[PDB]
Amino acid sequence: IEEVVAEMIDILAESSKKSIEELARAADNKTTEKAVAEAIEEIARLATAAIQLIEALAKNLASEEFMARAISAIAELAKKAIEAIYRLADNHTTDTFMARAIAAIANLAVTAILAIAALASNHTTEEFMARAISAIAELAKKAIEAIYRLADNHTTDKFMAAAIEAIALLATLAILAIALLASNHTTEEFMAKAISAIAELAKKAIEAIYRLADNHTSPTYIEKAIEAIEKIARKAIKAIEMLAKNITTEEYKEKAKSAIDEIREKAKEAIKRLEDNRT
Amino acid sequence: IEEVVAEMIDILAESSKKSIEELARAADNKTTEKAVAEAIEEIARLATAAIQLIEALAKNLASEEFMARAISAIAELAKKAIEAIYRLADNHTTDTFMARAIAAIANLAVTAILAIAALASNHTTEEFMARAISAIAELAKKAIEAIYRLADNHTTDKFMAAAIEAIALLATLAILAIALLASNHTTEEFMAKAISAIAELAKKAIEAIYRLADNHTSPTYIEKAIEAIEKIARKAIKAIEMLAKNITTEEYKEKAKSAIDEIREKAKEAIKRLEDNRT
Amino acid sequence: IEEVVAEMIDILAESSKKSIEELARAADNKTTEKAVAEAIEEIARLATAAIQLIEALAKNLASEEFMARAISAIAELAKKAIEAIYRLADNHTTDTFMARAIAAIANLAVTAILAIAALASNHTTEEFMARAISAIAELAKKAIEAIYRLADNHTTDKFMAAAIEAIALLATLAILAIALLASNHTTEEFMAKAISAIAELAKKAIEAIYRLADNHTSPTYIEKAIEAIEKIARKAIKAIEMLAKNITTEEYKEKAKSAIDEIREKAKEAIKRLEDNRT
């Protein structure tokens, strides 16, 4: 009975969340930063382990109802961990450790997204697939935002550039993950939302990278930021287009065409602002 | 040829065993405590990594004989790692690190249990599944006492509660894992053996939590211990109940209810005296 | 679309590689030996992480060329990390840290090989499997040399014995992995090539261990070295034989008989010279 298996999943989830919180609460009472990073590491490893366990267990589910429960559980684990890591990250003074917290957030997000994507591939109901797609989008945006806020506190362009790199992958993979699942929708309504979700991800990543990039002093890194931004846009456009290639009603695609145009105009404007501020 | 795959699995196991003890042996002559904790984590990683590798290798096996060896290998790894961690944990003076050691064992035990469950799910023969049931029970019991033994030498009570929770999950997860495997049996005698295993785990876990509670100083903790105990009891009973539902013969059922009756009252017995030890 | 999954794989591979080079670059300018080791741990985990992600994704591919891309990607990941680690290991003065470095190199190679082995099992065309066998063999040979070069820099015979062990495990598993993959060849031309790969691996591992053993002063470790060499030879010979039973043409078998003989003669020569060096 998967109900019992889903219960096994819940048990793992609640404990993981509980452990994460207490460890976080413990970290607030510690002084030396190396140990604070360890608290983040413990949170990161626990979340990664639990996600891996739940996924492997989730493959043994035939019921979408229970598969949605596993995905629902997995997403909250990621979000909870990301928040815990973020607030702990606010207490770091060394960019190296702040970079590691950023690294941890990205890797959790990638792990969670890919896990959800792999599970979501087995859904026949579009409603549940839309929820999985929604979860991925929310995870990507959350992780990207956390990284941005942390990035403002770096002094080294190299570390800010490293943050930019991490954001780009979160954007790319999330889009790709969404694309694979969105390709499997027969309902036109849900397909339009994926385009909307993708567009928002593109806008978020592009804006964040711009804002970090605007704080660079070295031309070499700003050029890397510019390179990164358009690649996100080009990826997003293909995703929207390919999904649009398989939809028949133009009403929704005209908005999809609008989405493509907005992504371009936002990206072109962002890059344009960056080049104008270069020497 | 699975013989070769089993040979790869065996090689992985022996190497893992070799590394774990050596690291443990090294740790006994080092002080610091940080390095001993590092050794424990390394041991945890070795066992977890090896178990994950072995499972993945074991999943491509069709012959049950080789799979039982794989299940046995996983069981042996845990016991060696657990025993090693326990003896090393006794060499720490800072209770926090012993609490961390408890975390490693619990997470380690869970990894092994689910792995065995996943392998055992592919068995058609009740005999080999029965070996897995005993193994899972033995892993939980070994880990639970190990956690129990460690809790007695520390000074901060809440970590006993942290230990108590960890104990609860081992009991909790083991029961469900046992339930899933027992569910695939057609012969009534073996189901009774599984119920007995469940009963032993429950009493084992419940007694431990009780023994920790008398060593607690503040009132809220025993209520949590009480909370922990009862959740274990109701489920185990429910698991036994649902398994008893699958028996047609009148003889065995009285023992299943006997198991239920013993689990309830003994649990009741443990808890109420705590109220006598409660303020 | 498998292209999209392969596209996701591409992002992960380049990024892991991106991070690996950067971590290596940072490590070379730092002074605390632990921080270099810390970077190595990061290199190991990231390399391990990407493989863990890629493998699960690659299993969802139907086109074999894309599977070969994944095998290639995994292979390139391992080599890059190993090379990076070696460069860092040369900067260690303490053998203790070097033993850990040896472990990391070994563990990465094992991870990649097993991943490829699991992936390679899904190829029906002998051509790509021959590439898969080749990739595994080259990874093994590369890892053996890196460890061998590092072993030359140790002062403690015990740590070299650990290095000898590390070489042995890689040789054995690669040989066994190749055997499993070679078992799936129908063309005798291709089966003979797998035998050749095994023979080269055997001679290489034996050669490394022999040269390391000559630098020992203690008989106890050299006796372990004879043991180490001999176990490898026995495994390789039987592996080649098992492959030979499924060959129908006597011509290729003579090469296998030759291959076995070359392995045997190499081992006795190696062992005998070691016996001449005992007191």
Least Cα distance to A139 among A164, A112, A117 occurs for A112
- What residues in B contact A49, CB-CB < 8 Å? 107, 111
> How many residue pairs from chains A and B have C-beta atoms closer than 8 A?
31
Domain with C196 in it: 1-279
Interacting residues of A122 by C-beta distance below 8 A, sequence separation 6+: A59, A67
Is residue A202 within 8 A of residue A141, CB to CB? The reply is no
Minimal C-alpha gap between B250 and chain A (Å): 25
Is residue A149 within 8 A of residue A162, CB to CB? The reply is no
Q: Give the method of determination.
A: X-ray
Across the interface, do B176 and A53 touch by the CB < 8 Å criterion?
A: no
Domain tally, chain B: 1
Contact residues of B toward C, CB < 8 A: 1, 4-5, 7-8, 11, 15, 18-19, 49, 53, 56-57, 60
Maximum distance among all Cα pairs of chain C, rounded to whole angstroms: 65
The minimal CB distance from B56 to the residues C118, C173, C179 is found for C118
The minimal CB distance from B11 to the residues C107, C172, C179 is found for C172
Any idea how long chain A is?
Answer: 279
Across the interface, do A180 and C5 touch by the CB < 8 Å criterion?
A: yes
Provide the 10 A C-beta neighbour count for residue A170: 26
- 3-state SS string over B78-140? HHHHHHHHHHHHCCCCCHHHHHHHHHHHHHHHHHHHHHHHHHHCCCCCHHHHHHHHHHHHHHH
User: What is the crossing angle of helices A157-182 and A126-151, to 10°?
Assistant: 170
The minimal CB distance from B8 to the residues C165, C176, C183 is found for C176
Minimal C-alpha gap between C188 and chain B (Å): 19
The minimal CB distance from B4 to the residues C107, C169, C176 is found for C176
Resolution in Å, one decimal place: 3.2
Among all chains, which residue has been given the structure tokens 């290798």? B57
> How many residue pairs from chains B and C have C-beta atoms closer than 8 A?
29
Among all chains, which residue has been given the structure tokens 């976080």? A24
Contact residues of C toward B, CB < 8 A: 103, 107, 110, 114, 118, 121, 165, 169, 172-173, 176-177, 179-180, 183, 239, 242
User: What is the crossing angle of helices A188-213 and A126-151, to 10°?
Assistant: 10
Provide the 10 A C-beta neighbour count for residue C127: 12
- Residue B46: closest CA among chain C residues belongs to which residue? C107
End-to-end CA distance of chain A: 66
The minimal CB distance from A169 to the residues C1, C15, C56 is found for C15
- What residues in C contact A176, CB-CB < 8 Å? 4, 7-8, 11
Across the interface, do A15 and B118 touch by the CB < 8 Å criterion?
A: no
Q: What is the DSSP letter of A217?
A: -
CA distances from A274 to A111, A157, A263, A265 (A): 32, 15, 17, 14
Minimal C-alpha gap between C108 and chain A (Å): 19
Helix (H) or strand (E) holding A149, with range, is helix A126-151
Provide the 10 A C-beta neighbour count for residue B95: 15
